[PDB]
Chain A
């Protein structure tokens, strides 16, 4: 029927002066563009078909041709930057924005999907979509008393597209676009579908990634408790972006950080820190590191929640990248902690796993660890206990590792490791 045509046949049909022939030919193009094994996107582009498809977007009298073009353009825009750029150069942005208003939900949804792919290309197209005025009609599609009455695939596409309009960093989206979208995003974050929740968390994660002014506008909407609740979800696709967003927030001010603490976040961390998914452990440990970089009373909350043995555990055994984050969490904690906090850290068993790590071929971890040693010595000094500390480092084999590091081909390692022996060994 319209299955398996050549591109030259599709060209013949689209150039006929017959709307029905054009329709058949567009659907044929769509079915070519819908196969998983190498769809001939470049062949279609090379044939000159994009501008014709874009003009079919405007055929209100022909709803089926509007849909097949939408779908064909969707799949093209789904390709490389060059393929997406061809769609945009065809004038497809305003035309897809106009179709958001279609009375046909399947057509309106296809327009949403296409705009998602265009914004997903990066900063410039995201921003180009926003200048065309996509946001208002996108949001007007979600202006319903209850989200549950929308078709679910449709709601998912809206959510994902809005999330691509929040994404990317150099530059971040316009402040006023972010302000416009946030209220609706807060609503979607309370919706009960897992994909809608996952992609709402992704959007919040994009929006909390950067300067503290951007964190602020999110935290101000009061989403942190709902984030923390999602952080406890059983679905890994929801936990991953909820954790990234929580982690982005605690890179912010002490007050912003305190908000995730007040939300109950640290109660979820015994399991996040022992999560069998190695990426959740990494991210959770990085998160812990920025909380240990907080106030003393924030550090104290890490203590009260029983989290320091979990940090010992991760430093002891974890994929190397997680250990690296753990080393940071310790360096931070020892640099901002009370002496009593640091004594506590040592009582939990930090020394021996910290020393084992000095065998790592990774200049940066070594610096981070020597820094933590020095910080801990500085607390031992204040208590007349450096000798008691030197013995533990000695007994676990830490001196051999510090001694070996003097002749290290790195100016920072040599200085601080000779300095440690000078002062303590």
Chain B
């Protein structure tokens, strides 16, 4: 399997303050 599975972690905002 030449598949490479582990990409650089990436996402939406983890945590968010209100205003």
Residues of A within 8 A of B (CB): 33-34, 39, 71, 74-75, 77-79, 84, 110, 113, 116-117, 120-121, 160, 163-164, 167, 198-199, 202, 205-206, 209-210, 240-241, 244, 247-248, 250-252, 283, 286, 289-290, 293, 328, 332, 335-336
17 new A-B contacts, CB < 8 A, other than A199-B12, A205-B11, are A71-B18, A78-B15, A84-B15, A113-B16, A113-B18, A120-B14, A120-B15, A160-B12, A160-B13, A164-B12, A164-B14, A202-B12, A206-B11, A241-B12, A283-B7, A290-B3, A336-B2
Chain A nearest Cβ from B12, distance in angstroms: 4
7 closest A-B pairs by CB: A293-B2, A120-B14, A78-B17, A251-B5, A202-B12, A78-B15, A120-B15
User: Are A335 and B18 touching (Cβ within 8 A)?
Assistant: no
8 A-B interface contacts by CB (under 8 A): A34-B18, A39-B17, A78-B17, A240-B10, A244-B10, A250-B3, A332-B2, A335-B2
Also in contact, A293 and B16, with CB within 8 A (given A167-B11, A206-B11, A244-B10):
no
Q: Select from chain B the residue with minimum beta-carbon distance to A237.
A: B12
Q: CA of A328 to CA of B19 in the docked complex: distance in angstroms?
A: 44
CB-defined contacts of A251 to chain B, threshold 8 Å: 3-5
Q: CA of A251 to CA of B7 in the docked complex: distance in angstroms?
A: 10
Q: Select from chain A the residue with minimum beta-carbon distance to B2.
A: A293
Contact residue among B1, B4, B13, B15 (Cβ-Cβ distance under 8 Å from A79): B15
Contact residue among A160, A163, A164, A286 (Cβ-Cβ distance under 8 Å from B4): A286
Residue of B5, B12, B17 with highest tally of chain A CB at under 10 A = B12
CB-defined contacts of B14 to chain A, threshold 8 Å: 120-121, 164
Chain A nearest Cβ from B15, distance in angstroms: 5
Residue of B2, B14, B17, B19 with highest tally of chain A CB at under 10 A = B17
CB-defined contacts of A117 to chain B, threshold 8 Å: 15-16
CB-defined contacts of B15 to chain A, threshold 8 Å: 77-79, 84, 116-117, 120-121
CB-defined contacts of A71 to chain B, threshold 8 Å: 18
CB-defined contacts of A167 to chain B, threshold 8 Å: 11
User: Are B18 and A75 touching (Cβ within 8 A)?
Assistant: yes
Q: CA of A262 to CA of B13 in the docked complex: distance in angstroms?
A: 32
User: Are B17 and A247 touching (Cβ within 8 A)?
Assistant: no
User: Are B12 and A289 touching (Cβ within 8 A)?
Assistant: no
Q: Select from chain A the residue with minimum beta-carbon distance to B5.
A: A251
User: Are A289 and B11 touching (Cβ within 8 A)?
Assistant: no
Q: Select from chain B the residue with minimum beta-carbon distance to A289.
A: B4
Q: CA of A39 to CA of B18 in the docked complex: distance in angstroms?
A: 12
Also in contact, A248 and B7, with CB within 8 A (given A74-B18, A75-B17, A332-B2):
yes
Q: CA of A145 to CA of B2 in the docked complex: distance in angstroms?
A: 44
Q: CA of A33 to CA of B1 in the docked complex: distance in angstroms?
A: 51
User: Are B7 and A286 touching (Cβ within 8 A)?
Assistant: yes
User: Are B4 and A290 touching (Cβ within 8 A)?
Assistant: yes
Chain A nearest Cβ from B10, distance in angstroms: 6
Chain B nearest Cβ from A136, distance in angstroms: 23
User: Are A293 and B3 touching (Cβ within 8 A)?
Assistant: yes
Q: Select from chain B the residue with minimum beta-carbon distance to A211.
A: B5
CB-defined contacts of B2 to chain A, threshold 8 Å: 290, 293, 332, 335-336
Q: CA of A286 to CA of B8 in the docked complex: distance in angstroms?
A: 11
User: Are A247 and B7 touching (Cβ within 8 A)?
Assistant: yes
CB-defined contacts of B11 to chain A, threshold 8 Å: 167, 202, 205-206
